[PDB]
Amino acid sequence: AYVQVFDKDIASYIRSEFSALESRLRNRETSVKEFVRLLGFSALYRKQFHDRYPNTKVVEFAFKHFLGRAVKNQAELIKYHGLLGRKGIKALIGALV
Amino acid sequence: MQDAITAVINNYDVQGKYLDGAALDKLKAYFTTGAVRVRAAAVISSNATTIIKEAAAKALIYSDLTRPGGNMYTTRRYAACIRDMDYFLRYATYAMLAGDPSILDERVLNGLKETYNSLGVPIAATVGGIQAMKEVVGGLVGPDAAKEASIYFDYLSSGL
Amino acid sequence: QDAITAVINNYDVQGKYLDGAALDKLKAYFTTGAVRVRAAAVISSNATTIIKEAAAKALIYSDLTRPGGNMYTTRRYAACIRDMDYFLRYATYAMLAGDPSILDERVLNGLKETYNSLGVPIAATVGGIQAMKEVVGGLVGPDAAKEASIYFDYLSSGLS
Amino acid sequence: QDAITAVINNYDVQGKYLDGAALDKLKAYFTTGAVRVRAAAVISSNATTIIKEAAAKALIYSDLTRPGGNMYTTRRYAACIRDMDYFLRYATYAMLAGDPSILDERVLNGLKETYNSLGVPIAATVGGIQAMKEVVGGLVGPDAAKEASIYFDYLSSGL
Amino acid sequence: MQDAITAVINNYDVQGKYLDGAALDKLKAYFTTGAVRVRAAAVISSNATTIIKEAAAKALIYSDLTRPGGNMYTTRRYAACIRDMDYFLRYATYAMLAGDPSILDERVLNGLKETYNSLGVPIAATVGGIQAMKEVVGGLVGPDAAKEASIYFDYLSSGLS
Amino acid sequence: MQDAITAVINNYDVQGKYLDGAALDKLKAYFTTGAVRVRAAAVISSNATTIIKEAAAKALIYSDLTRPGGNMYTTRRYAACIRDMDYFLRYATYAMLAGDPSILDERVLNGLKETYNSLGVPIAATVGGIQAMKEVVGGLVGPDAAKEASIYFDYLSSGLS
Amino acid sequence: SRYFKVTACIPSLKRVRTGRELQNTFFTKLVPYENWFTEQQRIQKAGGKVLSVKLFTGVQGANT
Amino acid sequence: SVLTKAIVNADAEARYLSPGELDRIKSFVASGERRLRIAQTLTEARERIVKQAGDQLFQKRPDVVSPGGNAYGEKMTALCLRDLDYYLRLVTYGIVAGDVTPIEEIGIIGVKEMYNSLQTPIPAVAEGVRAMKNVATSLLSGDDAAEAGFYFDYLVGAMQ
Amino acid sequence: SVLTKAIVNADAEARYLSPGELDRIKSFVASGERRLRIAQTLTEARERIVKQAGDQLFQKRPDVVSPGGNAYGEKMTALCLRDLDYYLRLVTYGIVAGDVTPIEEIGIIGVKEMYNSLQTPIPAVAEGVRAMKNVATSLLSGDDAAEAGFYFDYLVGAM
Amino acid sequence: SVLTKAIVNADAEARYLSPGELDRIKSFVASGERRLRIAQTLTEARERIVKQAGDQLFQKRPDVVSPGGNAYGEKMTALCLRDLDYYLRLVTYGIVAGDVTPIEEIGIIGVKEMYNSLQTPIPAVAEGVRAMKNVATSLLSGDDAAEAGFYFDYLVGAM
Amino acid sequence: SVLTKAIVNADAEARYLSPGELDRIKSFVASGERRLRIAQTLTEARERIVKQAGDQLFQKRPDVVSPGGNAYGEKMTALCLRDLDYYLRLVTYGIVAGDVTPIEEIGIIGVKEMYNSLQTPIPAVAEGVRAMKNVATSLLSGDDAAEAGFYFDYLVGAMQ
Ligand SMILES: *[C@H](C)[C@H]1/C(=C/c2[nH]c(/C=C3N=C(/C=C4\NC(=O)C(CC)=C4C)C(C)=C\3CCC(=O)O)c(CCC(=O)O)c2C)NC(=O)[C@@H]1C
Ligand SMILES: *[C@H](C)[C@H]1/C(=C/c2[nH]c(/C=C3N=C(/C=C4\NC(=O)C(CC)=C4C)C(C)=C\3CCC(=O)O)c(CCC(=O)O)c2C)NC(=O)[C@@H]1C
Ligand SMILES: *[C@H](C)[C@H]1/C(=C/c2[nH]c(/C=C3N=C(/C=C4\NC(=O)C(CC)=C4C)C(C)=C\3CCC(=O)O)c(CCC(=O)O)c2C)NC(=O)[C@@H]1C
Ligand SMILES: *[C@H](C)[C@H]1/C(=C/c2[nH]c(/C=C3N=C(/C=C4\NC(=O)C(CC)=C4C)C(C)=C\3CCC(=O)O)c(CCC(=O)O)c2C)NC(=O)[C@@H]1C
Ligand SMILES: *[C@H](C)[C@H]1/C(=C/c2[nH]c(/C=C3N=C(/C=C4\NC(=O)C(CC)=C4C)C(C)=C\3CCC(=O)O)c(CCC(=O)O)c2C)NC(=O)[C@@H]1C
Ligand SMILES: *[C@H](C)[C@H]1/C(=C/c2[nH]c(/C=C3N=C(/C=C4\NC(=O)C(CC)=C4C)C(C)=C\3CCC(=O)O)c(CCC(=O)O)c2C)NC(=O)[C@@H]1C
Ligand SMILES: *[C@H](C)[C@H]1/C(=C/c2[nH]c(/C=C3N=C(/C=C4\NC(=O)C(CC)=C4C)C(C)=C\3CCC(=O)O)c(CCC(=O)O)c2C)NC(=O)[C@@H]1C
Ligand SMILES: *[C@H](C)[C@H]1/C(=C/c2[nH]c(/C=C3N=C(/C=C4\NC(=O)C(CC)=C4C)C(C)=C\3CCC(=O)O)c(CCC(=O)O)c2C)NC(=O)[C@@H]1C
Ligand SMILES: *[C@H](C)[C@H]1/C(=C/c2[nH]c(/C=C3N=C(/C=C4\NC(=O)C(CC)=C4C)C(C)=C\3CCC(=O)O)c(CCC(=O)O)c2C)NC(=O)[C@@H]1C
Ligand SMILES: *[C@H](C)[C@H]1/C(=C/c2[nH]c(/C=C3N=C(/C=C4\NC(=O)C(CC)=C4C)C(C)=C\3CCC(=O)O)c(CCC(=O)O)c2C)NC(=O)[C@@H]1C
């Protein structure tokens, strides 16, 4: 999961920022989907994708990380890029999942 | 979560009442305590690792728990227990700044008893550890801060 | 699912081939169909107003909207009108389908439990649904109204 | 887990170093091991047939398969035979391991609750497991059968 | 990726040829080397942290790089550089077990030059570090293993160059 | 190209406005700076060869670049690099006289990055060389002139990077 | 922030699965309040039935 | 049925039914009466269709009703005919629904797996369905036959 | 409140409060006493602020209090004034909290949806809040007014 | 810096800066001049602070400067002092910024990994920073010291 | 043990055990008796191995047994030796299991965290394990030593 959501390189640096999240998963009180949501709603995600990229490139990365694909068509680019404006990154991530 | 200031606001909002002097006095009380709390929080953050170490030494280690067949036996279990200790400390610090116990309920306290019972973690020993942390914290923070710090530690203990 | 499919499913569990009696029920549905389509279009066009009128009849100018009421605060108000919209949309779907099942699968499932945890008042919600029914009845006209009413009543009974 | 690990774990909770008595239990397992491997190979090769025979004994020609029955419709029929395969594969794993724990960890845990929500009949499923056991017993041969039977019975008791 | 066994198979498959004695000989060669490689891999895994430490000491640290204005200055950059070193080591170990350089090309070598150029990481220094790791690794693995280990390290170095 | 005087004129021309006092003051500001700039330019022209030599000594030479396998290795490459350095110096001098950065954009800056990437010339090293030239130039020109000279050198550096 | 604890069962109607997939069929999960609405709908659309909903964290009818 | 499909698309979009979607529903309800007649015809002729198709299948495939073959023996032959009857019932359900979905859920999902456990040959089953189609086509009028053919073809495609 | 916001950010990061965050808390506690007085002033003048703002709004927008307009009629005009009163109460809460979060939960989320169902024009509501700000500013001292202005501006921005 | 942090939070929310956020910015700009002086003081006393702290650290931890220990030897001792100097420079940067972010990027991310490769003990490094704090506090005025303390504490917490 | 490993791989693939996998299990069960003897040897020599290794470690690291150091004092020195004994017991368990998994669960997961709370230096612990390996190797026959070495090396790698 760390490698999917962050990239490989950033995932290496992770020591235990998410240790509390891991425990809830280990406990089987959260699902894997929920765990992926919360990795997305994280300062680390935001710092590594959102903050140094224009909003279009942000939608790319989100598609890559949460669905494994690029953006299929201009209508899809509109819908998601739209929602990223006028709401958080936390909204985008939440919509995909 | 909720804090002291927001708690007052919310009580007034359900009544629909504008803020009144009595309410203001409660807010004013918090504001005086605030400066002390900030100092205490900084102390705790800096000494957090040691606080946990000392508390473990007081209760957890050199005990049946650490000995084979004990709950905290094996490295994995030992590490888990000290991780939990850290959680309690961090949340108590948050609560102390906030001036409200609610955050403890919302994050730490909810479902913990049930989790521990399924795991077979001993609640009384955990409570003992929390009380030990409180004592260590009390020293570092100093007396005025200690009273404030103690209530949140006691709240955690009672919940568990 | 649908009236047509409901008949089919009942026969399938029996293992019976479709029979004239079954066919007659299907035939009955086919005649009603045209009326239903007209009603659905009316409801879709007037949906915003229907909700407005129903809210005016029951929800607003009430304790609920007043401070300390369930629908007090913008967030809660918005939630309640969103729920009203869903009831209307699903009832329209049910009317076209000729079957109450979709209401059970979509609206009715998990609603009661959600509402109880939230502390949303069921009777008030039911009141709102009944109000929508009355408004809808007018717009759709009498023949359509009878058909529309049953689905609204079904929703109300489920919530209660 | 496994017989070998079970012995180890029992010693670890005691904190005791491995002793001859412990070693003897491990030795006992090692002798049984060769038989178990042969049994497992037999089961794997005949798995499809085992399921077929067991189904014939209990599941098919029954109300379940008839319309209105749980195993009616192709989808449900396929699900039931998939479940049967699971039980067989896990029992084979358990037999090699010499420990019932794997059954508890994977198969047995949450199955009752799942079945109740689904409306699958537990008693019929248990019947199917027992049928598989009987078929398996024949193929594996007597010495292997005793070992095989305990795991099948364990599954049945859990369900 | 591919390994030596699969590489032979794939070459034959494109030809459509059944496996022949010459092909068999290559496979046989691999099988003898295999046992040595497994031992070498275990050695490297256990001593990985030290290998990196020693190599850094030989080339990277006590240098302009670590000094302010150098590429490896700041904790974040220092940590990145040692992470990259670990990657090279892990992949070389994979390649050594496999007996094929292809994995290095598919994962490590592809796009590395471009990444480094954008980052402004100095390639020659990185190559120096890889060579240093090779020397340390050579000692630990022992001579027979060292020859095998060296080729993969050299392959990485040549790619980056 | 454009200069300061023409830049003011052009801004007014698009507006269609006759020249106004505010505009005149900007022009007046340039005229005072002008005399200093002319002196600086003459200094740079006379010392150009040395400036390049010193800057190369500071950054380019005695380095991996000059060593075999480096970009500036071989006489041909070495000569190319010093030719590029001369270009930057000449254009910066032109810009300083003009009082406008535009000429740098029109001649030097446009397409340089792409050219360098195809060539494999290292941009950061080139930038380093430009910065070195700036420092040498600053000394020769003297402080008042140096501030003016520095901005154009920095402009080149920013463009390349 | 309010959290919802939800237990829901979803049947695999489209295809029989060789993998055990016990977790997918029957799941208890913690949902953020905002997410739950959408999640509830998605379970309904799948044809899964939500047996139980509870508010794990927060207070019902709290203005803040 | 078609109506269910339309509703489902709307629900996914969370929107009221589009006019175009509504029009398709209208067309379907008009078509339904014709569809019912086609289904009725096949139901009446069901017994003969199965019998004729069975004979054709057995002629086409002597092997299935041979000592080696699955179909061989009275019990087995009955089961083979029962299967043919099941598929015919499903086809009738499909015609009234106007969609293959009813057919698909009951008969086409996991069919391969079920028959493989039984060891029944899938191609022979397909031939039987083809045979049934030919018999059914003869009794039906040409336009009716074309409609029925589509559903029959789907079954044959599914069991391949 | 300021403190709630800081804690929440820390919890997300799973870290103790940063020095910078702590400093902001310190500043807030010092400011609080002044803030309380500002809030008290507005509460006392509440009745007049609402009345004056209402009149200004109706002058600015004749349409709202016209037969077509939503505000028209005694019942409706009262409701419009009640809304203005609500927003003022929220602003006072905000000043003491030092953050818009308390304001935001009660008043700014779903506001668009609520008013659209009512059919009340959102821009007119914003004008009313602007009007209230001007009245409030006059009674407040300049520095106090600036603090109050921020909260008023937020409301106007939100709608 | 404070301002960077505020902007970043706003951009994530895709909103203009909140009044509360704006207020914090205002407070920071007022504080800045005082902050600059505090930083200047520490810079001037830097050489002595490092020297005194080093001595204290070595007294507190004899082991680090012992043949086994990492710090032992002139070269190594110099490097240990250089590290202390680095951390002091970072703290000064932090005070002017009003936030730990500048400190954090240069010094606190990957610090564990770097020191683990070096084999330097992290707790000893923390003690050195604590020692530096005490020296720095003495030279600073009480209020100034408190501000400086927060940044020093952060560093100690980070390692 | 090994067999668990094989089963786990099969379960992931959702397949019955491969013949090759089965063969490896057969080889392991044959090897086990030899492995038991190797383990027995180390158990008998355990007391001396620990003692010798301890002395070597203390010579290698004077600091650990120094007033600053964690090991310093009789109580602490005993605990350090107890830890060495624990690791030796784990190694014996590993040899009989044929896998590091038993070792890993009890000793290598969370080890870093546990020692960091204790403040014990991890590298020194590793040296102690290395020391134990050397002593153990001498008592063991060469082939036996190689087998034992692998487990010892793993521990050293883990604590690193
Ligand atoms: C230490 C004082 C005692 C102790 C602790 C211990 N805890 C676990 C396991 C868990 N503890 C929690 C608790 C939390 N998870 C969270 O997210 C939070 C809030 C921030 C808390 C407090 C949970 C959920 C688990 C399960 C998974 C996990 O590893 O966290 C164990 C492990 C028990 C086991 O059988 O594995 C232990 C040992 N037990 C003691 O011995 C002390 C008395
Ligand atoms: C005045 C500036 C504008 C105006 C106001 C207006 N409001 C209503 C009706 C309602 N307004 C509210 C508002 C709130 N309820 C809340 O909980 C909050 C958050 C604290 C607010 C602000 C509500 C709930 C209602 C519904 C009625 C009720 O309260 O029971 C009306 C009447 C419209 C109607 O048909 O009811 C009016 C006129 N109208 C304008 O055009 C002015 C610009
Ligand atoms: C309005 C007539 C009454 C009312 C409604 C009300 N509901 C909520 C919150 C929720 N209501 C639902 C319900 C549904 N979710 C679904 O998926 C469906 C089927 C389409 C329904 C009907 C849910 C899940 C929520 C929680 C989150 C959300 O917004 O969806 C509230 C808010 C309560 C709170 O404490 O936040 C309210 C007010 N309550 C009334 O006052 C009316 C009588
Ligand atoms: C002193 C408190 C403790 C100590 C220090 C120590 N450090 C080194 C070597 C290095 N330290 C660094 C650290 C940094 N580089 C940076 O960019 C930053 C952030 C600005 C830091 C903190 C580096 C890179 C090195 C490597 C050498 C180099 O700079 O090139 C040593 C030497 C040991 C070694 O193996 O090199 C020492 C002793 N260690 C202690 O024991 C003291 C308690
Ligand atoms: C170390 C010898 C040199 C060094 C390294 C260094 N690397 C980075 C940053 C990155 N390095 C990589 C490389 C890889 N990612 C991969 O997937 C692979 C193949 C498996 C490699 C080799 C990547 C992609 C990054 C960028 C993202 C990240 O940091 O994780 C840095 C940081 C540079 C920066 O500007 O941030 C450094 C310092 N530094 C030297 O100078 C040494 C010579
Ligand atoms: C010796 C006969 C004369 C002499 C030599 C001299 N050379 C340098 C410095 C350099 N000379 C070179 C030459 C080459 N680099 C290449 O790529 C090639 C072809 C392969 C050649 C021939 C270079 C690049 C340098 C620069 C040094 C560097 O590597 O950075 C010096 C030193 C002067 C200085 O300031 O560097 C000297 C003395 N000097 C004489 O007068 C002799 C007649
Ligand atoms: C010196 C600081 C660096 C360096 C330079 C270098 N450049 C080349 C080759 C070319 N340089 C240019 C550049 C320009 N032409 C222009 O029009 C402008 C804008 C005014 C510039 C700056 C061109 C076009 C060439 C190619 C044709 C030519 O040589 O005339 C080389 C040679 C590359 C090769 O592989 O042959 C070099 C070495 N390289 C360094 O090492 C320094 C960082
Ligand atoms: C067959 C002997 C009886 C039967 C079986 C039956 N099962 C299902 C559906 C499911 N069964 C399971 C069970 C498991 N999943 C696992 O991971 C394991 C352990 C490895 C087991 C045993 C599950 C989860 C399902 C859900 C569907 C899925 O594909 O996962 C059905 C279908 C019922 C339905 O309507 O969905 C059936 C019929 N029932 C009988 O009648 C036989 C007696
Ligand atoms: C006839 C074309 C071929 C044939 C048929 C055959 N079938 C069986 C046994 C069964 N067939 C079914 C099929 C279904 N059950 C369902 O619920 C559905 C979907 C509606 C179907 C299609 C089943 C489940 C059985 C089991 C018995 C039962 O259901 O009671 C046999 C007997 C073989 C056996 O071992 O039972 C036979 C012969 N065989 C051929 O070769 C013909 C080509
Ligand atoms: C000796 C090589 C080094 C050393 C040892 C040391 N250990 C402790 C304290 C403890 N050690 C453990 C470890 C374990 N618990 C387990 O379950 C396992 C795996 C089976 C191990 C290895 C524990 C639990 C403790 C806590 C105390 C207790 O016994 O309950 C100390 C004492 C320090 C303290 O603060 O307690 C020491 C000194 N330290 C060194 O310096 C040597 C290099």
Quick one: G14 exposed, middle or buried, by C-beta within 10 A (0-12, 13-18, 19+)?
Answer: exposed
Q: Which residues line ligand 5 (CB under 6 A)?
A: A 8-10; E 60, 65, 71-72, 77, 80-81, 84-85, 87, 107-108, 112, 115, 119, 121-122, 125-126, 129
The ligand whose atoms approach the alpha carbon of G33 most closely is 3
Residues of A in contact with E83 (CB under 8 A): 9, 12-13
Sheet with G49-57, strands from edge to edge, namely G26-32, G3-9, G49-57
Dihedral angle sign, alpha carbons of residues I109, I113, I118, I121: positive
Interface test with G, best of C114, C115, C122 (most G CBs within 10 A): C114
What is the CB-side half-sphere exposure of residue I14 using CA atoms within 13 A?
A: 16
Cα(J54)–Cα(J132) distance, integer angstroms: 8
Beta carbons of E75 and J119 less than 8 Å apart: no
Beta carbons of B15 and C67 less than 8 Å apart: yes
Cα(A46)–Cα(J11) distance, integer angstroms: 10
User: Is the Cβ–Cβ distance between G50 and G42 less than 8 Å?
Assistant: no
The residues facing G9 across adjacent strands are G26, G49
Judged by 3 or more CB pairs under 8 A, whether I touches D is: no
F42 lines ligand 7 (CB under 6 A): no
- Which single residue is written with the structure tokens 């350090």? K80
What CATH number does the domain containing C53 carry? Answer: 1.10.490.20
Token couple for K89: 């017991």
Q: Tell me: is residue B39 an annotated ligand-binding position.
A: no
Closest CA to D149 of D102, D100, D109, D112: D100
Cα(E90)–Cα(E44) distance, integer angstroms: 9
Token couple for I118: 């009512």
G32 lines ligand 3 (CB under 6 A): no
- Among the residues of chain I, which ranges form H helices? 2-13, 19-44, 46-60, 74-97, 101-103, 111-118, 122-139, 142-158
Cα(D120)–Cα(J9) distance, integer angstroms: 52
Cα(E127)–Cα(A37) distance, integer angstroms: 39
- Name the amino acid, one letter, at K88: L
Q: Tell me: is residue I82 an annotated ligand-binding position.
A: yes
Neighbouring residues of D68: CB distance < 8 A, sequence distance ≥ 6? C13, C14, C15
Q: Tell me: is residue K130 an annotated ligand-binding position.
A: no
User: Is the Cβ–Cβ distance between D100 and D126 less than 8 Å?
Assistant: no
Residues of J in contact with E76 (CB under 8 A): 105-106, 109-110
Resolution (A): 2.8
Q: Of G9, G17, G18, which is closest to D117 when you measure between CB atoms? A: G9
Q: Of B83, B87, B115, which is closest to A27 when you measure between CB atoms? A: B115
Token couple for J80: 């240990």
Cα(K128)–Cα(K61) distance, integer angstroms: 10
Token couple for B155: 């709240």
Domain range for D7 is 1-159
The residues facing G6 across adjacent strands are G29, G53
Phi, psi of D91 (to 5 degrees): -60, -40
User: Regarding beta strands G3-9 and G26-32, do their DSSP bridges make them parallel or antiparallel, or are they unpaired?
Assistant: antiparallel
Domain total of chain C: 1
Cα(G58)–Cα(B106) distance, integer angstroms: 6
Residues of A in contact with J122 (CB under 8 A): none
Neighbouring residues of F58: CB distance < 8 A, sequence distance ≥ 6? F132, F135, F136
Neighbouring residues of D139: CB distance < 8 A, sequence distance ≥ 6? D42, D43, D46, D50
Cα(B58)–Cα(B132) distance, integer angstroms: 7
Nearest CA in chain G to A24: G30
* E50 lies within 8 A of chain K by CB: yes
Beta carbons of G1 and B106 less than 8 Å apart: yes
* Least Cα separation, residue G1 to chain I (angstroms): 10
The helix (run of H) or strand (run of E) holding residue E146 is helix E143-160
Beta carbons of G63 and B14 less than 8 Å apart: yes
* Least Cα separation, residue I12 to chain A (angstroms): 7
Closest CA to I57 of I120, I108, I111: I120
Neighbouring residues of H112: CB distance < 8 A, sequence distance ≥ 6? H122, H159
User: Is the Cβ–Cβ distance between H88 and H50 less than 8 Å?
Assistant: yes
Beta carbons of G30 and A34 less than 8 Å apart: yes
What is the CB-side half-sphere exposure of residue H19 using CA atoms within 13 A?
A: 2
The residues facing G57 across adjacent strands are G3
Three-state secondary-structure class, residue G57: strand
Judged by 3 or more CB pairs under 8 A, whether G touches D is: yes
H106 lines ligand 9 (CB under 6 A): yes
CA distances (Å), origin B158, targets B4, B107, B127, B152: 21, 15, 8, 10
The residues facing G4 across adjacent strands are G31, G55
Method: cryo-EM
Cα(K44)–Cα(K134) distance, integer angstroms: 16
- Name the amino acid, one letter, at H95: I
Nearest CA in chain H to G18: H113
User: Is the Cβ–Cβ distance between J144 and J41 less than 8 Å?
Assistant: yes
Token couple for E19: 């496996």
Count of G-H CB contacts under 8 Å: 8
Cα(K69)–Cα(E146) distance, integer angstroms: 39
Q: Tell me: is residue J34 an annotated ligand-binding position.
A: no
Q: Which of K58, K75, K76, K83 to mutate to test the pocket of ligand 10 (most atoms within 8 A of CB)?
A: K83
Q: Which atom of ligand 2 is nearest to the CA of I89?
A: 20
The packing angle between helices B21-46 and B123-141, to 10°, is 100
* C73 lies within 8 A of chain G by CB: yes
The ligand whose atoms approach the alpha carbon of F156 most closely is 7
Cα(E44)–Cα(E57) distance, integer angstroms: 18
Beta carbons of E79 and J107 less than 8 Å apart: no
Beta carbons of G16 and H12 less than 8 Å apart: no
Judged by 3 or more CB pairs under 8 A, whether H touches I is: no
Q: Of J12, J110, J112, which is closest to A46 when you measure between CB atoms? A: J12
Neighbouring residues of E115: CB distance < 8 A, sequence distance ≥ 6? E121
User: Is the Cβ–Cβ distance between J38 and J139 less than 8 Å?
Assistant: no
Cα(H106)–Cα(H120) distance, integer angstroms: 18
Distance H151 CA to ligand 9 centre (A): 21
Q: Please calculate the CA angle E114-E116-E122 and round it to the nearest 5 degrees.
A: 135
User: Is the Cβ–Cβ distance between B141 and B33 less than 8 Å?
Assistant: no
Beta carbons of G61 and C118 less than 8 Å apart: yes
The residues facing G5 across adjacent strands are G30, G54
Cα(I8)–Cα(I12) distance, integer angstroms: 6
Token couple for I135: 């009245």
Dihedral angle sign, alpha carbons of residues G16, G18, G20, G21: negative
* Least Cα separation, residue A10 to chain G (angstroms): 27
Cα(I68)–Cα(I58) distance, integer angstroms: 14
Cα(J2)–Cα(J27) distance, integer angstroms: 10
The residues facing G31 across adjacent strands are G4
Neighbouring residues of B128: CB distance < 8 A, sequence distance ≥ 6? B59
Token couple for F80: 């190319």
The helix (run of H) or strand (run of E) holding residue G38 is helix G33-46
Quick one: G23 exposed, middle or buried, by C-beta within 10 A (0-12, 13-18, 19+)?
Answer: exposed
* C55 lies within 8 A of chain H by CB: no
Cα(C121)–Cα(F126) distance, integer angstroms: 73
DSSP state, C55?
Answer: I
The packing angle between helices C122-140 and C20-45, to 10°, is 90
Beta carbons of C74 and I117 less than 8 Å apart: no
Cα(C89)–Cα(A65) distance, integer angstroms: 35
User: Is the Cβ–Cβ distance between B129 and K117 less than 8 Å?
Assistant: no
Neighbouring residues of C82: CB distance < 8 A, sequence distance ≥ 6? I113
